[PDB]
Structure 1
């Protein structure tokens, strides 16, 4: 039919589904794995490459790799496999019949977008296309028109102030702190005890450990003193092989580098100061409205105590006269996809498509004159 499709692929996660719904239909990690050992059976295996859930299921004898890194595609041959798997082995749909909507982080090379649209038009033969900023759809999902948006995932962390539909492009900030840095720091600090992890499967195990038992401390020094004094903060985790591990003060030291980037050697400011700097670069009249409409989205902002910690950090910098409010919906993980699905079903979003006639009459460089 004419129903549009939404595919919000990320640094390490891909969510695809039909438009007009309220939840993604296919969510799976974007990894590609190949075997490394020798095959001795008459079959010696079945295939030479695994993409999707089966790659992680058989990760014990595979070398997993991520096509996308820091939000920029580096391997242009695995993305074709991933998109083919998404379109055929996950949705069972013919791409030559439905429009496709894609999302991309701001401040990225134009060659990436041009190659993306060129290989999307000339390989899958979709009849329409559009590329939208990830953080813009967060306001659509929330149902607002003004407010600064913070989005964090496996890629980059970026802010964009929007006021009554007129976004300011001269106050957009972008960082390079994400889940991969957090799990690498957790892997490094886990070597402090006897545990050691070097393999990609062990990297996935450490990622799962970070997802399960982690939180953000309201006060770092007091939490450190309590952990060193009472030693009642320890948790227990069970490895697949059967052994158990115990972690104490490392639980709240993993998200701390998100607020103090000096832990991993980066020279920058935390997420509490970047938002304040972005706010103070806007106009004087609209500062008050943005201060009381903070919006949070993305998986990385799913930690328990992030909201109170960020509110406390922001309230110190801002003047005491006004109020600071942070909006953290419980379903903020699948927020970009919901906004994209809402946008794709609008009545006025019908002449904003990029038809194939325009593409093959002008060229791949048309995406720079029709998308923000």
Structure 2
């Protein structure tokens, strides 16, 4: 049987087999095109690079992302990425391999339908399925009750689950994600004298964010300590040299999550969004939801995000009850792990969308089957 699991995401692709411990193929979802003249002969060089190949040669080509905010915008580029992760990296023939895909909540309906057409016609898979990302995150932890805040690169969303029952009317979606955090870092870096405008230079700024930035417990008095002393500065070495220094911008970029007014959005922070979802549910189920808060998604991997979230939540909730933010140690590959577990149960082998059903019903079978 050997079912396949694929996590498209936005900016990172995780692929592997069902029943394993970790994905066997991780690579960025980027397609590049040459930019310059192209002199000399006998080189035999390709016209487009996809995956980790584009990262190595990013100095002469332009990076482009097909998926954005969860929705796929370039369908011609996505067929190139799926071909790369099936024949070149996994080295498998999809003709005898059911696949599992993931999808964010509150997405256009046409997004699901087009994914089914490509897999069932271009690749000719025998079966396929589509599942919500945040539901699979609860399978990895071996739990049944709790509220999951899954923040990635495209979109962060919230959904409460109580004893295997979802509440579709208490689901909140917010655009703020890790991609908008990188752009804010680029803007506030110009006040020190550094300019980063090329699309190939957006990777330089992203790597700085992943290594230096951190979340401060308190914002008012942290800016006071950084204003006087210089003990909060670290150095980064660019690829060609010219080391740089980072001061109070180190803890200012992640703060946008709790104060989304730094870019201009009117929505509330992630600490108030998750409180409104809890108060939208029933009265007697809120007690179990407070003590089962789950964190998932790489943008929730900042040093100190678990203690800051706890401090703000207890300021709103009544003081009688106990609030504990359950942040596991491996939060980035939590969705994939849940997908592998789900695709191995004996009771799940009846909900596959077969080829016969698609031929008789058409692409509209997804909404009647998947969710």
TM-score (norm 2): 0.99
Unpaired runs of at least 5, structure 2: none
Answering whether residue 300 of structure 2 is matched by residue 301 of structure 1, we say: yes
Q: Deviations over 1:187-232 (max 9, x none)?
A: 0000011100001121000000000101000000111000001121
Q: CA deviation at 1:114?
A: 0.1
Q: Deviations over 1:68-90 (max 9, x none)?
A: 00000000001000000000000
Q: Is the 8 A contact 1:154 1:180 kept in 2?
A: yes
Q: Specify the alignment match of 2:353 in structure 1.
A: 354
Cα distance in 2 for partners of 1:81, 1:16 equals: 15
Q: Is the 8 A contact 1:39 1:45 kept in 2?
A: no
Q: Specify the alignment match of 2:327 in structure 1.
A: 328
Q: CA deviation at 1:43?
A: 3.6
- CA 1:259–1:45: 2 relative to 1, 3 Å: farther
Q: Specify the alignment match of 2:133 in structure 1.
A: 134
RMSD: 0.7
Cα distance in 2 for partners of 1:7, 1:337 equals: 8
Q: Deviations over 1:48-74 (max 9, x none)?
A: 000010101000001000010000000
Q: Deviations over 1:230-288 (max 9, x none)?
A: 12101000000111000000000000111000001111000000000000000001000
Which deviates more, 43-52 or 276-285? 43-52
Which deviates more, 248-257 or 40-49? 40-49
Q: What is the DSSP-based 3-state SS (H/G/I as helix, E as strand, rest coil) of the residue aligned with 1:39?
A: coil
Cα distance in 2 for partners of 1:212, 1:151 equals: 21
Q: What is the DSSP-based 3-state SS (H/G/I as helix, E as strand, rest coil) of the residue aligned with 1:289?
A: helix
Cα distance in 1 for partners of 2:196, 2:67 equals: 23
Q: CA deviation at 1:45?
A: 5.2
Find runs of 4+ consecutive structure 1 residues off by over 4 angstroms. Answer: none
Q: Deviations over 1:312-354 (max 9, x none)?
A: 0001000000000111111111000000000000110011000
Q: What is the DSSP-based 3-state SS (H/G/I as helix, E as strand, rest coil) of the residue aligned with 1:7?
A: strand
Cα distance in 2 for partners of 1:9, 1:200 equals: 22
Cα distance in 2 for partners of 1:106, 1:121 equals: 23
Cα distance in 2 for partners of 1:284, 1:189 equals: 44
Q: Specify the alignment match of 1:152 in structure 2.
A: 151
Cα distance in 1 for partners of 2:280, 2:43 equals: 61
Q: CA deviation at 1:139?
A: 0.6
Q: Specify the alignment match of 2:343 in structure 1.
A: 344
Q: CA deviation at 1:44?
A: 5.8
Unpaired runs of at least 5, structure 1: none
Cα distance in 1 for partners of 2:150, 2:40 equals: 48
Q: CA deviation at 1:9?
A: 1.1
Cα distance in 2 for partners of 1:107, 1:145 equals: 22
Cα distance in 1 for partners of 2:38, 2:201 equals: 23
TM-score (norm 1): 0.99
Cα distance in 1 for partners of 2:66, 2:272 equals: 31
